[PDB]
Scaffold this motif. Sequence first.
Motif, PDB file in Angstrom:
ATOM      1  N   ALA A 186       0.939  -1.778   0.002  1.00 31.16           N
ATOM      2  CA  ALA A 186       0.035  -0.013  -0.205  1.00 31.16           C
ATOM      3  C   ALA A 186       1.150   1.343   0.217  1.00 31.16           C
ATOM      4  O   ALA A 186       2.037   1.178   0.401  1.00 31.16           O
ATOM      5  CB  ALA A 186      -0.624  -0.234   0.968  1.00 31.16           C
ATOM      6  N   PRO A 187       0.536   2.156  -0.659  1.00 26.38           N
ATOM      7  CA  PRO A 187       0.992   3.697  -0.288  1.00 26.38           C
ATOM      8  C   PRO A 187       1.771   4.059   1.267  1.00 26.38           C
ATOM      9  O   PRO A 187       1.383   3.610   2.083  1.00 26.38           O
ATOM     10  CB  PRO A 187       0.454   4.305  -0.514  1.00 26.38           C
ATOM     11  N   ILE A 188       3.022   4.083   1.248  1.00 27.62           N
ATOM     12  CA  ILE A 188       3.623   4.662   2.250  1.00 27.62           C
ATOM     13  C   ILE A 188       3.190   5.769   2.719  1.00 27.62           C
ATOM     14  O   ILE A 188       2.936   6.474   2.197  1.00 27.62           O
ATOM     15  CB  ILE A 188       5.363   4.765   2.242  1.00 27.62           C
ATOM     16  N   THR A 189       2.918   5.738   4.059  1.00 26.49           N
ATOM     17  CA  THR A 189       3.228   7.033   4.979  1.00 26.49           C
ATOM     18  C   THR A 189       3.686   7.008   5.535  1.00 26.49           C
ATOM     19  O   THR A 189       4.616   6.119   6.695  1.00 26.49           O
ATOM     20  CB  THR A 189       1.389   6.799   5.702  1.00 26.49           C
ATOM     21  N   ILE A 190       4.248   8.545   6.175  1.00 28.05           N
ATOM     22  CA  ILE A 190       4.522   8.906   7.175  1.00 28.05           C
ATOM     23  C   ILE A 190       4.108   9.922   7.841  1.00 28.05           C
ATOM     24  O   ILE A 190       3.929  10.995   7.561  1.00 28.05           O
ATOM     25  CB  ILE A 190       6.552   9.570   6.918  1.00 28.05           C
ATOM     26  N   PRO A 191       3.233   9.663   8.911  1.00 28.67           N
ATOM     27  CA  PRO A 191       2.133  10.558   9.729  1.00 28.67           C
ATOM     28  C   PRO A 191       3.348  11.519  10.183  1.00 28.67           C
ATOM     29  O   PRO A 191       4.603  11.195  10.360  1.00 28.67           O
ATOM     30  CB  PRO A 191       1.740   9.283  10.506  1.00 28.67           C
ATOM     31  N   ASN A 192       2.598  12.759  10.500  1.00 30.92           N
ATOM     32  CA  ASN A 192       3.193  13.135  11.260  1.00 30.92           C
ATOM     33  C   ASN A 192       2.655  13.496  12.616  1.00 30.92           C
ATOM     34  O   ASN A 192       3.200  14.623  13.729  1.00 30.92           O
ATOM     35  CB  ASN A 192       3.239  15.043  11.128  1.00 30.92           C
ATOM     36  N   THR A 193       1.761  12.394  12.954  1.00 30.02           N
ATOM     37  CA  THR A 193       0.822  12.910  13.981  1.00 30.02           C
ATOM     38  C   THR A 193       1.515  12.194  15.043  1.00 30.02           C
ATOM     39  O   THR A 193       2.657  11.519  15.440  1.00 30.02           O
ATOM     40  CB  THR A 193      -0.793  12.454  13.757  1.00 30.02           C
ATOM     41  N   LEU A 194       0.641  12.158  16.741  1.00 25.88           N
ATOM     42  CA  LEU A 194       1.616  12.599  18.133  1.00 25.88           C
ATOM     43  C   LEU A 194       1.111  10.714  18.268  1.00 25.88           C
ATOM     44  O   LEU A 194       0.769  10.129  17.470  1.00 25.88           O
ATOM     45  CB  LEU A 194       0.199  12.957  18.654  1.00 25.88           C
ATOM     46  N   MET A 195       1.429  10.480  19.624  1.00 27.88           N
ATOM     47  CA  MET A 195       1.969   9.190  19.613  1.00 27.88           C
ATOM     48  C   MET A 195       0.928   9.472  21.537  1.00 27.88           C
ATOM     49  O   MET A 195       0.987  10.526  21.714  1.00 27.88           O
ATOM     50  CB  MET A 195       3.179   9.534  20.571  1.00 27.88           C
ATOM     51  N   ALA A 196       0.598   8.425  21.609  1.00 31.07           N
ATOM     52  CA  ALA A 196       0.235   7.946  23.013  1.00 31.07           C
ATOM     53  C   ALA A 196       0.562   8.452  23.489  1.00 31.07           C
ATOM     54  O   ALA A 196       2.195   7.238  23.761  1.00 31.07           O
ATOM     55  CB  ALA A 196      -1.270   7.282  22.309  1.00 31.07           C
ATOM     56  N   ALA A 197       0.302   9.108  24.829  1.00 27.59           N
ATOM     57  CA  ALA A 197       0.758   8.456  26.413  1.00 27.59           C
ATOM     58  C   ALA A 197       1.184   7.509  26.947  1.00 27.59           C
ATOM     59  O   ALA A 197      -0.326   6.487  26.824  1.00 27.59           O
ATOM     60  CB  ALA A 197       0.486  10.166  26.862  1.00 27.59           C
ATOM     61  N   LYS A 198       1.723   6.379  27.101  1.00 24.21           N
ATOM     62  CA  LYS A 198       1.602   5.623  27.535  1.00 24.21           C
ATOM     63  C   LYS A 198       2.405   5.083  29.354  1.00 24.21           C
ATOM     64  O   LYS A 198       3.064   5.952  29.902  1.00 24.21           O
ATOM     65  CB  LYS A 198       2.702   4.647  27.507  1.00 24.21           C
ATOM     66  N   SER A 199       0.982   4.652  29.654  1.00 25.82           N
ATOM     67  CA  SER A 199       1.126   4.212  31.377  1.00 25.82           C
ATOM     68  C   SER A 199       2.109   3.571  31.279  1.00 25.82           C
ATOM     69  O   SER A 199       2.015   2.108  30.374  1.00 25.82           O
ATOM     70  CB  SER A 199      -0.153   4.006  31.989  1.00 25.82           C
ATOM     71  N   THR A 200       3.143   3.011  32.305  1.00 25.23           N
ATOM     72  CA  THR A 200       4.111   1.785  32.433  1.00 25.23           C
ATOM     73  C   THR A 200       3.665   1.075  32.986  1.00 25.23           C
ATOM     74  O   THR A 200       2.687   0.861  33.522  1.00 25.23           O
ATOM     75  CB  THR A 200       4.976   2.448  33.635  1.00 25.23           C
ATOM     76  N   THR A 201       3.917  -0.271  32.547  1.00 28.68           N
ATOM     77  CA  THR A 201       3.144  -1.557  32.648  1.00 28.68           C
ATOM     78  C   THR A 201       4.552  -2.442  32.908  1.00 28.68           C
ATOM     79  O   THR A 201       4.088  -3.630  33.023  1.00 28.68           O
ATOM     80  CB  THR A 201       1.913  -1.931  31.704  1.00 28.68           C
ATOM     81  N   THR A 202       5.803  -2.291  32.370  1.00 28.04           N
ATOM     82  CA  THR A 202       7.310  -2.853  32.791  1.00 28.04           C
ATOM     83  C   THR A 202       8.081  -1.822  33.528  1.00 28.04           C
ATOM     84  O   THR A 202       7.887  -1.124  32.733  1.00 28.04           O
ATOM     85  CB  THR A 202       7.899  -4.244  32.033  1.00 28.04           C
ATOM     86  N   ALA A 203       8.938  -2.518  33.972  1.00 25.86           N
ATOM     87  CA  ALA A 203      10.385  -1.527  34.916  1.00 25.86           C
ATOM     88  C   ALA A 203      11.230  -3.147  35.344  1.00 25.86           C
ATOM     89  O   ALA A 203      10.340  -3.631  35.516  1.00 25.86           O
ATOM     90  CB  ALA A 203       9.477  -1.210  35.827  1.00 25.86           C
TER      91      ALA A 203
END
Lengths: 50, 50
Positions: A33-50
């Motif tokens: 499919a057409p490659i996309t390079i989105p500018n859009t944002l990242m969702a914030a992630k709650s930590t589940t491993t450390a």
Amino acid sequence: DENRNLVNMQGMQLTGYPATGTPPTIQQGANPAPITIPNTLMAAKSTTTA
Amino acid sequence: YSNEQEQVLGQIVLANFANNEGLASQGDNVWAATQASGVALLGTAGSGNF
């Protein structure tokens, strides 16, 4: 370009396998499919491993 | 100022385009936005894109 595709000088769109999942990965089962390079944002992630 | 105080007077804006190659040369090193370049996206030096 503005559509976030990689285009040649005629405006044709470079194609390849999409990324899916979280974390995103490339599968062997995918339709090019057409490659996309989105500018859009990242969702914030709650930590589940450390 | 000569009272040993300062006043902010403004803040210069910078612009970026999705496609700089699309900008219309106006002569010298001055440019106008076009449909090809996309709209100017504005910000400030030292933040975000700039």
